[PDB]
Amino acid sequence: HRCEWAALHCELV
Amino acid sequence: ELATRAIPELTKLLNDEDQVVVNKAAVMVHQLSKKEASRHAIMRSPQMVSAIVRTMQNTNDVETARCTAGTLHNLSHHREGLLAIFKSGGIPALVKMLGSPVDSVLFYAITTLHNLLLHQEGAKMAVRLAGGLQKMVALLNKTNVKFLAITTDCLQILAYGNQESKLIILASGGPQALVNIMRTYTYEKLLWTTSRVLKVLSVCSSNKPAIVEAGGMQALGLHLTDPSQRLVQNCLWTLRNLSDAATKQEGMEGLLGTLVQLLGSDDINVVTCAAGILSNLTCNNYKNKMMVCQVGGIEALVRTVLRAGDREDITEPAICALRHLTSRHQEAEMAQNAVRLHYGLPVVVKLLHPPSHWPLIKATVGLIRNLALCPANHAPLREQGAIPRLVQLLVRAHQDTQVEGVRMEEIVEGCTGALHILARDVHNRIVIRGLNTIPLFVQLLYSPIENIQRVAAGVLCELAQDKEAAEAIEAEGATAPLTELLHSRNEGVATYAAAVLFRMS
Ligand SMILES: *CC(=O)Nc1ccc(NC(=O)C*)cc1
């Protein structure tokens, strides 16, 4: 968790 | 430098009418947003952010909409960048871009909107005001599961603690699209995030039927075996919310078998949720009562009560589930004997002892009344000491009526009802008489509640076949209220009242 949305944001864009 | 000329000049070029000039500037602005030194000078110029926001809406060049949206996504990684996007009318623009056919623009918009919802205050009100909730629900038809996980988290941030956002999601067809996500995909982060949205939408009574009729109960039960602990937990919480408003739903078979097997989990919180769902699903549903007994639900629930000990958050739903299973279905006699055959009577009677509270005591008494219907339980219930406590709880409830959300008359009706059925055994009546219960039962004939009158005359009718007992009842002056209860419109009260009067002679 924690900065787990930033890693997902990075792989998508 | 930069702030003095380059950015003012780039701002001037970014809002030129020559589309080729705008596209050339947008590419340079996108490149400047990739390093801390120049990116800082962009967010410190509200004139530049405004030009990027307006260009992103009005342009018809895909490469420019990609560069402007990709720019805004780069400023959204820190505090003052999010505030510059917020104050420059960026949120209504990013909501407009959610209807873009370009995937790069759509992904840049949903990630920038997600960053704003996570760290920028005032963004929840702005996204709702700009119609963001509707556009997000319509995007659940997309197949990119990484995009779906972000879109569902935005809905969860908007819907948590906000009735307007919940109602908008339900009105736009939200539940059907979310249930289909749990039904189709296997990506853990998407399934976990979607379950948190279904959990928020299930905490209200009038909003639950939408998730149920769409097949949400079965779709959530699919992932109770998944290795993700946070996914199983959110599925069990949502199922427990939906359960009490879905006790009439068809096709709960496969879910009930999984819930029974979850009672063997090492996670105490998983066993607690599973017991609470089985309690709600088995209430007044003879089909759910059947399938649970066919998969070994009695042994698993009796084993659960033992494991819990004095943890009333586990014993109460487990005892309530056992009370449901032991009444009003084909295999009711099977469930009543099964509680004995799997060694449940000692811990059931023990739960009448302190330190149990009233909600657990009320549920335990109702189960004993059901178990007393089986004749093979008359002696084991007596030899475990159930009669002396059923009387002692009855005396305590009579003093506070002659608490903790429990009406003390339901305790009086329940305790006397168990003694009324236990009195079918000869040896039981010897114990019930030896505790000075006949005077108390006579005073219960004056109760204004019919069901208490029916059970008081019922236990007096059972005790009256002992000749010396019929005289003690007559000596306590029961003839006067019994003759009154003869004229009762309730046939059950008048039937037992005539029986005592007949046996007193
Ligand atoms: C904590 C943190 O900053 N994590 C993080 C993860 C991933 C990325 N980006 C990519 O993997 C492309 C950035 C930061």
Residue numbers in the entry:
A (entry chain F): 3 to 15
B (entry chain A): 147 to 548, 561 to 663
Q: What sentences appear in the manuscript?
A:
To target disease-causing proteins that are inaccessible to small-molecule or antibody therapies, we are exploring the use of a nature-inspired drug modality that exploits the intrinsically favorable properties of synthetically constrained α-helical polypeptides (Helicons). Here, we report a rapid, high-throughput screening platform utilizing phage display that enables an unbiased mapping of the α-helical interactome of a given protein without any prior knowledge of its structure or known binding partners. Analysis of 14 high-resolution crystal structures of Helicon–protein complexes across six different protein domains reveals a range of binding modes, all of which are “side-on”, i.e., mediated exclusively by Helicon side-chains rather than involving main chain amide interactions. Biochemical and structural experiments demonstrate diverse functional impacts by the Helicons which bind these sites, including inhibition of protein–protein interactions, inhibition of enzymatic activity, induced conformational rearrangement, and induced dimerization.
